[model samples]
Target: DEFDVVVIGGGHAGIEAALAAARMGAKTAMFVLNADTIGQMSCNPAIGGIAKGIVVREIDALGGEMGKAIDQTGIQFKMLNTRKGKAVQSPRAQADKKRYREYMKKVCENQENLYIKQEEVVDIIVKNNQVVGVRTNLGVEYKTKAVVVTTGTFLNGVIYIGDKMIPGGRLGEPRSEGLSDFYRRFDFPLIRFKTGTPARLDKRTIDFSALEVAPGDDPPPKFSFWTEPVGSYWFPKGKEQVNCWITYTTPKTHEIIRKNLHRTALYGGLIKGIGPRYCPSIEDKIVKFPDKERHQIFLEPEGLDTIEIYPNGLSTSLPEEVQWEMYRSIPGLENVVLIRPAYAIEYDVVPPTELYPTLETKKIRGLFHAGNFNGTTGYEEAAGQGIVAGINAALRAFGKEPIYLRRDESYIGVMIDDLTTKGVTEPYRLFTSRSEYRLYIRQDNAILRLAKLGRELGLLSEEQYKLVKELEREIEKWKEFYKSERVRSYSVATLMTMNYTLDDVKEKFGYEVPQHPYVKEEVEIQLKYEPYIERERKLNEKLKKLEDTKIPPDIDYDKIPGLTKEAREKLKKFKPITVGQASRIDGITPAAITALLVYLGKL
Candidate 1:
């Protein structure tokens, strides 16, 4: 094999996969349909929203490039869900779209051990059931020990602009077709899922006076912790962030959508794919919530260079005429000019049940999947899976131990477990609600938990690893201090009883012991959230017991009589590796868990 790994598709997943492989001493090549669109924000011109921001931090902690790239190119920075308390507070930032793409294109072109090959991969070459190479549209074949397919919305992609259907991934990129058929040869069930993007409108045409201002945070936080006092890559941090505007869709917008249902791909029976329930189209929103008076629309800039804006809430697949009608009804966008029309793209996706926790296919040796290709929606989700795929794929090449994070440790682990175990009915999205241990997985402490893995895998530089070790030591020291800090006979409790904040107490005593800001911050979290963290930790202990109980891969689910029909079917389909995973499988209830536990115990 000329390359250790061949990463198919150069979206978020592909780049991360390519980087992970190369960073860990593998010769990697990433094939993209278009080299220019590496790390393209396909849906929204933003990164780190809701549960996603935490993931970007985790990626950075694991030595992935997303946080650095976003830090370098982000124009608008805001921490979302701040009112919800610290456990739920998420950081979101809008990128300079053109700059982000341009930055990443150059990075991929010049990265050591990673070759960015601009080729449309058409088919996988398998020998004796293991992926051996990939054949491109140009008839070029690249040999590799492993192949990571991050096709995203390109495999058998069909884009709908109203009723007019076009065979493409994004607007103009050529969609990969033969890979879909190639996958079917192994009997991998290919399901169709649709996702949409809002129309890009000229900001010059939008009346900002009619809209409310949505500004970025005061001292905007950077995504990467390694970047403080401004990073060299992120040249313009600590500057005045770009602003966004907000408006609402009125009764006229709903009226327009309902009146033109015949022109929509979903309503017109033109799209048979299932769209994301959380992110619904304009037509879906109107019909789904009929009593709702109006939908909120955010006018967000596409980039610093362009006056184009992404109409955040008005996602639609209605015809050009209907799209204009709906947009005109929105308050600020009454006379907006469209630079790019909204469209819903439906593509074939492999349900993650076919994959292992490492994101590699269980049915095919040396073959893996990531991103929207495996039914996950967000860039964070996709990149998380991509790194795992790349690490494991590279590890497989060297015949070493493959690594994966446990659910209690990371939301990324939770996502992979949910996908590979229960599988997703819709485009899987990460939420704070999805994690059982959100308090433990705070964005601030990503390096605390994940840096060890990154360093162990050769992802982090020697300096970064030393810094992470220092961070770990500092956190432990602070935690122990809160547990028993008698600083000149003034305990943290005594200081607090005197109405002294952690910041004040730390400032007074910090320099004597040389304390890091986050040390006290973590102490603060512990003091308030100790009971919550402890309670979750105890429950996690119980779950860990179940997790320790391994299920024989050859176990016959059909032979298990006590399991319900649904449980049996689901267990058979999922082939869960652990009793803990079996418990989380959809339709495999508590009773089923008990039964499975008992059966495994007896065996």
Candidate 2:
């Protein structure tokens, strides 16, 4: 079979890549070990955290599918960092794992030009420095114009349980083999990364009596703007809402881990890959923060109908016996039975520096990479990359101009730039602090930010584009209304400045604010952080000039005199598309950037 684009893996990244290409009118084929595991939450069955939630919202604004899926399957929702500031505010949700996976699968199946092939991609067929197709383990050769590899923890996957180790992607899934050899043959620098998950506890056996119940927000935040109130509420806001429980690891729990440290896969030298620094294992936490007597453990419900609950903060690769003993030592989990023992999985990942800003490989014309395959940590980060890779692959197939988002524009842009430039030693996870223009890139205004770009790229439907335009009009109207509507010195604006409640503002103003919480928040931010937003806009304008300076595709840095050996080597290696990108590469110091600027001017 022939396809315009072939997506490898069926996890979050692959799903977005396949769907994006298909939706963009490309004939797309997805090769997966099993179709049933499509969109499966191998670790936590939740979506959105810190900067990740912003990525989800941005994906939705650009016509991607993750936000809608989360809105449908979310059992509990909360806006994190509410106390901090709007720049750090992110919407988080605990989803029904089974339902979320099913929803995503349905969306992929419904995409016009997408086809799912249940097979493991063993080799990528390249012809004269371009991806021609893929060869499956079943000996089937499927031709494709472009290939996107988003194989999350599947390529040469190795699972470790204390002293015991096995070859597998997940519990029952077979490990992907041969692809790593293919990647190495292409001269792609591959690294090993390990990630661990906590054991699932039987909720029926867990005593909620001793744990503090953490309920969802009164009016929860929605992931997608298209997600309207689901029957009297904006989301699944009914009686079936799950409540998360908080407990702590006691001295006894730490003592058990201390005694059984040798049995841990990480400490026992059974795992070779580097795990995520942000989401570390239980052993890592105890060792890193020895002074702390207790560590928080969140018991999150898997679903409204299911009895299984995830231990959010207790991820470990300890032996089953040690896991049971340690978990029993914790408060409220004294009677908890392990449904699945936690384990660490190591997988192969290609350094993203090999790819252009468009996500297409510099060495291979039609090859692209995204998600965990690029060594990123979260689902949202992977999904964002998948969208970009998919779009660029489709664009290349269609002979259209490639799209590249800017760092000042979206978190996705910042993430990709960081990956290609600095390169990550650990599994790169997105954080609000990483974004310089986060104040201007609020989750509420994502549609306003990226819908036009989606339309220009033909990723959004005509009706959908028109809907975005209408929303823009509504936003403008609100802005004008807020500006024109005036009160005395004791105005609603003054009251809002004083941290008065929304009700207080309404009472003072004698007019109700917009029914949409998002619109209200946008207005509030615009008024409060106007100076910061303006500064970001000005800074973006300056950066855009640097970003706009195109670098010749065929420039040979080796021939350029006065350029340092390291700078020239990096330039030859990365093959950056723009002067700005080349300047950002490591070892290419400020002096190197100046040298390149002078050389480009001479040319």
Candidate 3:
């Protein structure tokens, strides 16, 4: 049977891609190595933290499944950076790992126009520079219009635990071969990237009495806007919530790691792949930041029923004996028993510069890539790319024009633009610092920004779309209402700017405001942060001019005068399609942008 799209690998990226394609009315088939491992949280039991949390909300706003899945299976939830301004704040949740996978697998099973195939896609069949079908390792072939390779860390994966090496994607899973070799045959530029996970310790074996408890918020945060509070109350009050514990690695722990540095696979030069700088391994942390005295580690439960505890900050690739020694040196982990030893896995990734902003490969007409396969390093980053790839694949199958997301739109937009434009020297991870339009791209307003687009694509249900529409109307209405009303000497809107909240107004002034949480919050934020929002919006408008200015695809950068040699070389290599994108390339200067604009008659 013919399918509109076939998604290879069922990790975070593949799950979102397949679901988006299927939900968009494409006949989608998802191929995986193991059916039970679908939606597996490979590294962490938690989802969303810092900028990643906002990406999950963006994924939800775009009608993707990640936020919903986490919300349903989350064992603990918290809103991070609450003391900071609203824009920097995000929601993170610790999920029941097994239950999260089961929820997503069940969702796949129940999804219409979607099929789950437990088969390894060994080769993507392309004809005339376009993907036509895929061949499985079992000699079975499936016909499809487009293929999304979200194979993640399985592409030529090699796991290293100190000197001992294993040919696997994870601990027990077999490494995927042939596909990376196939990519090489097509002259696709590939780079090796590595990532590591911390050892999972037995919860019962750890001394938690000495550690500080990290509790969930009173009214637990939900990732999905559509997810309602359980009954009329929130978690921990209406029900129970899990508590994670925090411990610190002492100088003694560092001494053990420093001594075994030569034995660790990372320091021994067994790994050639560049790892993520943001989420560095313990070896990297110790080697790079030699002056630091200690690093905090969070011991989080993997699930409610499991005895496994994930030590969040202690990722490494040291030997089993070394791991035991190092873990025992930590304050609260004096006798911690390792359930699984930490290891680093190196895999093949297509230099994201090979992809367009839409995640389609420049070399292949109907081939797309996402996740770690595209040199990104987080579940949220992968899923953000996944939704875009899936939507474009479905659109390609349906003979429709592709959609382009601008940098100011959402964190996903900023990430995709950065990946395709700048090209990563190391594994790319999104930070709130990466975005210039962070104020407008807050997690709370993801639906306000992107759900309409999801609705237009038919990815968001009418019910979901309706809520955003209603919220939009209410927000505007309340904003105007607040501007017209007064408390005492000051108008109600003026009080909002004075750092007074809606609840404060109702409390002090005995004035009734919008009771709906969304309306109340939106109104307060908009009125209070009016100047900041306007400043950013204005800055965005200035950049929009450059974004709107197009450079002809056939233009020769070498022929243009007034271009710096470095700028010309980089522009030619990246082949940026717009002035905005060209200006962002590292070596491309303001003078080079002016030269390009002048050449294009847009100056």
Candidate 4:
């Protein structure tokens, strides 16, 4: 078997990568360990929260598939951070876990020029300086022009429950063994990171009377603009929606974990990897914040029909006895029967600094990596990187320039830059703090930011491109209308700051505002955040100079003189793609960039 692009692992990252490559006219093949586990949410039974939702909207704007998949299977939806400014307003949803996986698999099956091959890739075939193919465990040789290794939590995966550990990816999925060893042969640095999921409780047995109910928004905002509400083709009628519940972990729950800490594999020093700081285990919470009397736990539905509910924020790898004791102490879960005991999984991840902004490995050409394989923690981060890597891989095969986003442009750019430059100490997760120009990176404006780029790359249809242009015109018209309108003793801008409704503004201005709520929201954000947005644009202009200034790929950093020992060492370590990227590397000060610029000129 042969393909232009081969994507390993069929999770969120692999799905986006395979789809992007195939959509760009590459003969792409995705290799998965299990066909049914495609796009499975092994951790939480939901998608898109806080900064993650921004990434999902960005993916949809670029014609990626996650947003559409979520819309098809989402049981409940809410706009998070509504009280905060528009920059932080993100759409989150609790999904039907089983149906979401099935929906994603169907999309993968239908993607043009894409095929799924069920096999475990045991080793990659690298000839000379470039990737040529991969060898499956069954001794089948599959050739590819480029290989994208998503490999989420399956590389030498070890699942831990209390002091007991087993080799597995998720509960029953087989662990990938031979491939991690194969990667070591190339001298690429590998780090170990761990993440845990909470146990699922049988919904029928649990007492829901004591927990606070959390319902979905009355009129849910769709994640993907291309998708309509529940009656669409992908999301047919008759799907039952479900609600989530919130509860607190009492002092007794913390005390049980504290007493049983030594029995847990992680606390006993049986685990070797670092875990996610944001998504900590119950043991971690108890040990780190001993003074805090309680922690919040969200009980989310696995599906509308299933009697199992995922307990978010109660992640643990404690002893079975301890887990059982602590879980029963929580309100409304006194008789909870565990469908699957909570556990932590540790796996090998490549230090993302090994790749260029294009996500192509510096050690081997035509070999790219994304998702959890790159030490990133979230599904949105993985999907974003996967799209970038898949796009660049296909473009490289077609003899086109690889696409790279700027840090100030999108959250995707900030994620890749952080991975390649800063290098991650633990599992890297995206947050609003990581992006410097987040004011311009809102979820509402993703289409305005990336649709043109998608069209240029042939990822979006002509009809889609035209629709975006129409949206742009409508937004501009609304902005102009607001600017010209006057208020009593204040400019229309003063009324903008007062949170006046569009109807009030129209009545005051003597004209109707744009009919579309999205258009209205866009106009309001632009007006309200006008000063902040301008400053961000100016900052972006300065960053763009560095982003666009290309550096010769073959330049030897060690040869440049007047550079500090630290600058030379760090520069050689990262092998940055541009003078700007080199400038951003730690210890590579502005003076060092000036020296490098002079050196490049002399060359």
Error of 2 at 217 (Å): 1.0
| lDDT per residue (tens digit) for residues 42-66 in model 4 | 8888789878888888888888999
Listing every candidate in turn, what is its Cα RMSD in Å to the true structure after a full C-alpha superposition? 3.7, 3.2, 2.9, 3.2
lDDT for 195 in candidate 3 is: 84
| Residue 125 displacement in candidate 3 (angstroms) | 1.7
Can you write out model 2's per-residue Cα lDDT over 396-455, one digit (the tens) per residue?
A: 878786778877778888898898777777788886237667687876677778989988
- Which 10 consecutive residues of model 1 have the lowest summed lDDT? 228-237
Tell how far residue 593 is off in model 2, in angstroms.
1.3
Q: Score each candidate by Cα lDDT.
A: 0.80, 0.81, 0.85, 0.82
Residue pairs with clashing backbones, model 1: none
Show where candidate 4 strays beyond 4 Å.
229-241, 268-279, 488-490, 508-510, 539-544, 558-561, 597-603
Give the per-residue lDDT of model 3 (tens digit) for 292-363. Answer: 788778899999999999998889998889999999999878887998999899998999999888888888
Give the alpha carbon lDDT tens digit for every residue of 273-301 in model 1. 33323546777777766677876777888
CA deviation > 4 Å runs, candidate 1: 230-238, 267-277, 485-500, 504-515, 552-573, 587-603
Error of 3 at 582 (Å): 1.7
Residue 545 lDDT (model 2): 70
TM for every model, in the order presented, reads: 0.91, 0.93, 0.94, 0.94
